[PDB]
Write a protein that binds this ligand. Structure first.
Ligand SMILES: NC(=O)c1ccc[n+]([C@@H]2O[C@H](COP(=O)([O-])OP(=O)(O)OC[C@H]3O[C@@H](n4cnc5c(N)ncnc54)[C@H](O)[C@@H]3O)[C@@H](O)[C@H]2O)c1
Ligand SMILES: NC(=O)c1ccc[n+]([C@@H]2O[C@H](COP(=O)([O-])OP(=O)(O)OC[C@H]3O[C@@H](n4cnc5c(N)ncnc54)[C@H](O)[C@@H]3O)[C@@H](O)[C@H]2O)c1
Ligand code: NA
Ligand code: NA
Lengths: 498, 500
């Protein structure tokens, strides 16, 4: 059902050194629909060697030190190809990761949009070169150079397979870096198709290299590679710790875009059905596999009863089916491992004394696949595992509040800090919550809309740094000051012996 | 001679919890001239707790979330007191770390300059708040808020005691952070005087806290503290690895400003005496204890012989003495441990077959103190320890080159990448070298001028990140996007329940 591709190293299709493979499991049927290479340390070494050789080739005039206008042409051309292959790519995305077709089509528009946005950033880089720095001494002059950081290691998750890859590839390429992409072993199909798009577009050999494989066998040697200049990582807090620990012996820079347990605070002065839809979107869209999921609902006590009943009616109305089926609004979760973890979180919540308001069972009409009904859990306590840990399934927990200070304390009662949301008709209250909730992104009267134009990132256990936005390219650039002594006078610090 | 201070926690002078002290060793006389608190994990905990309580007090309205213009007044008040106390601070700096008085005096001007630059940055921050972001959908609006990252841990070295502390304190405070400074156990005197200035200017309690002590006893608990939001570190590559490994289980962000082995490339088309002075300044000033030291001279074969002869004439003319003595141009090195480490680098070079062109011994006229003559080592080989490793003494190594490709390969033949320099009458050649040398700072026709207006940092084993410059305040700020749905239409992704 999916293409049979190899690893992409030095602009050519390369089989894995050890000849091992991993299955492509369809989450709707539980069947193997293909295979991806099982990359190892030798394959990573080859991809890093190719990225290194491409960066230094012809003093870097073919890519790295070439004008931004040149790299922008390949970026815009990759975006044109993704739009051209949109139905096949969205279908492969739904087949590989389980997300509804409508979500996967949205993802493909954003992939091209992100390549387009960063092509403009590459052209904007030329104007930023040799930027003067005003000094307090007329005897000196200063200018800034913004050079590619070098060979970058890009490690991504399975929840937006091609989009997560694009978030790192598009700015890294725009900056003039050469890269090694290690996408998730759970969803590598569309990334291998991007490799085909690059080959088809004639992207210079070795500029983008793709090594598929298991986290410990392909990800870990890439993260710890002595010849990788920077690691840009997106994944769990658990893996983020290993990524930073692997970089420490080489004082190697990293960016960490990790998990979350984001809150949504819904006040009593809302349009109930509008607030309910955004709460369901904030926890159930992407099949609940949202890094920024507003997975803790903080609902005002005055409307809680009515709100909870409206949520259950909307949740029970969500069409759960094969992601390729018309009108699908909930697909299966990515894999068996993920499904079992979500099952365990749900049973632990029941054991701890929580109430399953709705869901927490397989949908009646779907005997096969990693299908889970939209789940709402009430009578939650702050000490429960379900309140503290990232579930990564369509599982929402609910806590009531009576005052604005109780809501802010409960919203910040997390060791994470990726995102947050506030729903209220009171504008001044929305302003207060936007200031007081500790997170990289606060939504007002919504939850989840993520624009390429704005910086994205977490605080605390959600990691550090910001990706995307007008500073997105700067993650892959190194600043060099060039300071010149322009006086013909001797320095005059030391006494001349003559 | 030095003042007797305690730790500075929550606006108070606080003795260390375990009551232990560390001597203040005068490097000129080798004698104990005072004592500093030997802080431990309990003292670090109290400092972090005070910074956290100050950040959160009154919803951050009096500091963290106050306008940048309010914090700017305190940064300007600190700068004015530094100038007011300049001769006494410069004298204490020379007594504590060993640098000549004229250098210590320059550092105090740079301390005040840095606080003034960051006060302007705090006022500029107010203009940057709530910045709009244009979106490709009219149903949404987006603005950016730049908030303090929170409680920050600032760990610094002894080579520019008050200035290194200032490089981190000024932008952190400008951003609205609260901080805990852990300065070096070898030079804590002026940093403790900064705490006295903070008290004098009425800095709100807990905003700045200072815990002195040994690196493993005070530095390490700070770097690994669960309530520290970010660690800004300056020190060796050896320590930098520990800082980053300590932060990893908490996914705690860090910036690392580490060591270097920076090259200076001198072409034949140069005024000899002018290139010589900059070469010596790039390796011997700060008594050779320069992170960005151009410790590797790459000299063109056509002028190498005359260049070495002129370097020896200038070096032998440097007045080596007590840093408080008029005309001092080279003081002793900071400590006995450093003095011994430098002597070992010189003997290992001699043992490895290198030539001691000049110096390499203690001055005959100075019986006491950690004094080492200006040293130049020639007939170097790239396998030698002296080529590879940071010496941190007034010790220069010399390599000859005949081609530009050879000079570039040699310049980049290091696992460091802090800085570099090129000296040549050919401007196009100077530009080629500025592009090819892999480092954060390239000086042209000079070596060492460091302006707080410009970003500063290293590549490779020299660390990552940039301090100072227009982006310096951003190391202490965390961006928050505020994205609002402005449409009166329902989202319309899911279907409203209407089924029978
Ligand atoms: N923008 C963001 O902050 C963002 C976006 C999407 C997802 N996420 C987070 O990602 C997680 C879900 O993704 P996942 O299950 O793929 O996460 P994961 O941490 O298990 O793996 C992510 C990637 O890291 C690799 N990896 C795993 N172990 C590794 C190791 N030891 N060394 C190096 N690489 C290794 C994996 O193969 C994969 O490519 C969630 O926690 C989610 O919140 C964050
Ligand atoms: N801008 C820069 O890149 C820059 C500037 C100046 C100095 N330096 C570097 O600094 C070094 C000289 O300074 P130093 O001898 O004080 O360096 P150091 O690394 O030994 O110590 C620096 C600071 O870290 C503390 N520290 C030591 N061990 C620690 C540990 N285990 N955990 C936490 N903190 C610990 C020390 O007490 C001190 O405050 C040189 O390598 C020099 O190149 C770099
Ligand atoms: Na899959
Ligand atoms: Na001292």
């Amino acid at each position: 059902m999916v293409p049979l591709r190899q690893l992409f190293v030095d602009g050519e299709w390369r089989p894995p050194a050890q000849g091992r493979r991993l299955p492509v499991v369809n989450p709707t049927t539980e069947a193997h629909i293909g295979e991806i290479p099982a990359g190892t340390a030798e394959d990573v070494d080859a991809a890093v060697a190719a990225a290194r050789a491409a960066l230094k080739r012809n003093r870097g005039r073919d890519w790295a030190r070439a004008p931004g206008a040149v790299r922008a042409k390949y970026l815009r051309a990759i975006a044109a190809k993704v739009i051209e292959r949109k139905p096949e790519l969205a279908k492969l995305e739904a087949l590989d990761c389980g997300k509804p077709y409508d979500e996967a089509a949205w993802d493909m528009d954003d992939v091209a949009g992100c390549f387009e946005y960063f092509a403009d950033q590459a052209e904007a880089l030329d104007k930023r070169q040799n930027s003067p720095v005003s000094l307090p001494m007329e005897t000196f002059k200063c200018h800034l150079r913004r050079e590619p950081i070098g060979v970058v290691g890009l490690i991504t998750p399975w929840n937006y397979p091609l989009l997560m890859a694009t978030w790192k590839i598009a700015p890294a390429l725009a900056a003039g870096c050469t890269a090694v992409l290690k996408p998730s072993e759970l969803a590598s199909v569309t990334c291998l198709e991007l490799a085909d798009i690059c080959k088809e577009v004639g992207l210079p050999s070795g500029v983008l290299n793709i090594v598929t494989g298991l986290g410990p066998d392909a990800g870990a040697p890439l993260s710890a590679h002595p010849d990788v200049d920077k690691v840009a990582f997106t994944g769990s807090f658990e893996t983020g710790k290993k990524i930073m620990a692997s970089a420490a012996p080489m004082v190697k820079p990293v960016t960490l875009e990790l998990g979350g347990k984001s809150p949504i605070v819904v006040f009593d002065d809302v349009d109930i059905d509008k607030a309910v839809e955004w709460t369901l979107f904030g926890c159930f869209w992407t099949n609940g596999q949202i890094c920024s999921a507003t997975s803790r609902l903080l609902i005002h006590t005055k409307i809680a009863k009515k709100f909870n009943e409206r949520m259950v009616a909307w949740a029970k109305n969500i069409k759960v089916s094969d992601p390729l089926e018309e009108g699908c609004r909930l697909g299966p979760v990515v894999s068996e491992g993920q499904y079992e973890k979500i099952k365990k979180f749900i049973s632990n919540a029941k054991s701890q004394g929580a109430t399953i308001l709705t869901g927490g069972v397989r949908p009646a009409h779907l005997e096969k696949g990693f299908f889970i009904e939209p789940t709402i859990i009430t009578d939650i306590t702050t000490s429960m595992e379900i309140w503290r840990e990232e579930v990564f399934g369509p599982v929402l927990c609910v806590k009531e509040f009576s005052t604005e200070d109780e809501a802010i304390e409960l919203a910040n009662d997390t060791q994470y800090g990726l995102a947050g949301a506030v729903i209220s008709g009171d504008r001044e209250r929305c302003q207060r919550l936007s200031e007081e909730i500790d997170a990289g992104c606060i939504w007002v009267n919504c939850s989840q809309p993520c624009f390429c134009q704005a910086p994205w990132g977490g605080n605390k256990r959600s990691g550090f740094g910001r990706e995307l936005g007008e500073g997105g390219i700067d993650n892959y650039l190194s600043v060099k000051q060039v300071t010149e002594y322009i006086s013909d006078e001797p320095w005059g610090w030391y006494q001349s012996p003559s």
